[PDB]
Amino acid sequence: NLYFQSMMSKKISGGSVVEMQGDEMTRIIWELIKEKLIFPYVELDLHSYDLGIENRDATNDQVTKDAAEAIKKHNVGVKCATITPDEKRVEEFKLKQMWKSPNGTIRNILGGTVFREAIICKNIPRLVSGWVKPIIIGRHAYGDQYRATDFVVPGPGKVEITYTPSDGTQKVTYLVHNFEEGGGVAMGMYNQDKSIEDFAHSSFQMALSKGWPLYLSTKNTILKKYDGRFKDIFQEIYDKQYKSQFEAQKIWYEHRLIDDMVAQAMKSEGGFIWACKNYDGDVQSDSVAQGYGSLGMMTSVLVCPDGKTVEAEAAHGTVTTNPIASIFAWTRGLAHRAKLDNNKELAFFANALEEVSIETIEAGFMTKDLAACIKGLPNVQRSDYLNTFEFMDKLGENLKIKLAQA
């Protein structure tokens, strides 16, 4: 019967995508984006996992692990912002327990490097004067504080850390501290050579791809072994495989100590790749995003080690109405889907939604937070901005106009 029916869609054939629905207001906006900007124009084979807090509670966090496995399988995730619950959220939402970070879980499973960068609009002023070009952070997605084991130390006693080799070689025990004073806290943490090796590769690849120098930040003067391993693995790798390519593009790779690097970034004019360790990537990406003008205006795409799988996300929720991050999580995921499938139509679509998003804002049609950034929240009146629904409609109006013209 497949030969006899021509039941092929008038929409762009979008292909396979794993979606992860999120929390709060972002979940609401997500749907609006789906209904007004994506689905009218693109048919998709969506696999949908509800990662809202309330469904994670219902499925004892299993849905998160399944969402992650589905991403391994279909190669593209697009995720809405979610809650990582604290003490008070457990009470508020009558939850079973404090579900660990879903992003942590997803990233542990998938692996890779999370590339984050501002979404720049000519009329949204920067907070840092000299940043005339973008700064791209590659956040190492694995290990460190995100897969640590931390605990309270109730009283006097000795915390030790040990390593028992797989083979026969005996144990190595190291004192961490001898509490004789009272109690405190203690943690152990780790990372792994292959993950680090992958981290490096991606960073070198991004640098080459943009034509920009790369810096890795650590604090190997203090963490001589732990961070020394990062510094070493990157240097090794750069010398063997990338130095010549880099010299050919008139760019370079340097290690920097973390505190020097943040000052360097702040003093810079932009236009470099910044390889960061997990925590640092988490911390510096927010700073950089806010420095470009808005915390919400940011892309964030986990690029897996397999050179194929990708998870795009809206990284921030409501900050404490801006749909652009969510919009661009869809466009970046679809741009990548179009890459895998060699679909010129899908990639034209993704790119056009992005342009229209930015042209709309540049033309003076924007949500309240963006209008706050221009003239200060105290000075903002109703007529300066569009509400969530009105903004989405206005983007719909303009996306339709621009997709017609092709």
Extract the annotated binding site for Mn(2+). 259, 282, 286
In angstroms, the CA 393 to CA 177 distance is: 60
Element (H, E) at 201: helix 193-210
| 132 sits near a second copy (criterion: CB under 8 A) | no
In angstroms, the CA 322 to CA 370 distance is: 8
Decide whether 74 or 79 has the Cβ nearer to Mg ion. 79
Q: Which one of 32-40, 54-62, 128-136, 306-314 is the stretch in contact with a second copy (CB under 8 A)? A: 128-136
Burial letters 269-281, b for 16+ CB under 10 A, else e: ebebbbbbbbebb
165, 244, 378, 405: residue in contact with a second copy (rule CB under 8 A): 165
Residues 6+ apart with CB under 8 A from 134: 117, 118, 120, 270, 271, 292
Shortest Å distance, C-beta 296 to Mg ion: 11
Q: How far is CA 379 from CA 267, 324, 372, 374, in A?
A: 30, 23, 8, 10
Q: How far from each other are the two terminal CA atoms of the chain, in whole angstroms?
A: 34
Exposed, middle or buried, 316 (CB in 10 Å: 0-12/13-18/19+)?
Answer: buried
Q: Within 13 Å, how many C-alpha atoms sit on residue 378's CB side? A: 0
Binds 379: which of K ion, Mg ion, a second copy, none (CB < 5-8 Å by kind): none
24, 43, 46, 104: residue in contact with a second copy (rule CB under 8 A): 104
Which residues is 114 bridged to in the sheet?
139, 302
| 108 sits near a second copy (criterion: CB under 8 A) | no
Q: Taking CB under 8 A as the rule, which mask of x and - marks residues 306-345 in contact with a second copy?
A: -------------xx-------------------------
In angstroms, the CA 404 to CA 392 distance is: 18
| 295 sits near a second copy (criterion: CB under 8 A) | yes
Could you tell me the two tokens for 145?
């504080």
Total residues interacting with a second copy, rule: CB under 8 A: 86
| 133 sits near a second copy (criterion: CB under 8 A) | no
| 184 sits near a second copy (criterion: CB under 8 A) | yes
Decide whether 40 or 188 has the Cβ nearer to a second copy. 188
Shortest Å distance, C-beta 320 to Mg ion: 14
Pair 19, 378: CB distance under 8 Å:
no
Residues making up the annotated binding site for substrate are 84, 101-107, 116, 139, 219
Decide whether 4 or 174 has the Cβ nearer to a second copy. 174
Shortest Å distance, C-beta 286 to Mg ion: 5
Shortest Å distance, C-beta 281 to K ion: 13
Q: Rule CB under 5 A: which of 243-262 touch K ion?
A: 257
Decide whether 159 or 257 has the Cβ nearer to K ion. 257
Decide whether 221 or 241 has the Cβ nearer to a second copy. 221
Decide whether 266 or 401 has the Cβ nearer to a second copy. 266
33, 114, 124, 128: residue in contact with a second copy (rule CB under 8 A): 128
φ, ψ of residue 14 to 5 degrees: the values are: -85, -30
| 221 sits near a second copy (criterion: CB under 8 A) | yes
Query: Cα dihedral sign for 25, 293, 261, 248?
Result: positive
Helix (H, G, I), strand (E, B) or coil at 362: helix
Spell out the alpha helix ranges (H) of 34-112. 53-58, 62-74, 87-92, 102-110
Binds 148: which of K ion, Mg ion, a second copy, none (CB < 5-8 Å by kind): a second copy
Shortest Å distance, C-beta 376 to Mg ion: 25
Binds 154: which of a second copy, K ion, Mg ion, none (CB < 5-8 Å by kind): a second copy
Decide whether 233 or 392 has the Cβ nearer to a second copy. 233
Decide whether 354 or 369 has the Cβ nearer to a second copy. 369
Burial letters 35-74, b for 16+ CB under 10 A, else e: ebbbeebbebeebebbbbbeebbeeebebbbebbebbbeb
| 97 sits near a second copy (criterion: CB under 8 A) | no
φ, ψ of residue 45 to 5 degrees: the values are: -95, 80
| 364 sits near a second copy (criterion: CB under 8 A) | no
Helix (H, G, I), strand (E, B) or coil at 1: coil
Binds 166: which of K ion, a second copy, Mg ion, none (CB < 5-8 Å by kind): a second copy
* Contacting positions for Mg ion (CB under 5 A): 259, 282
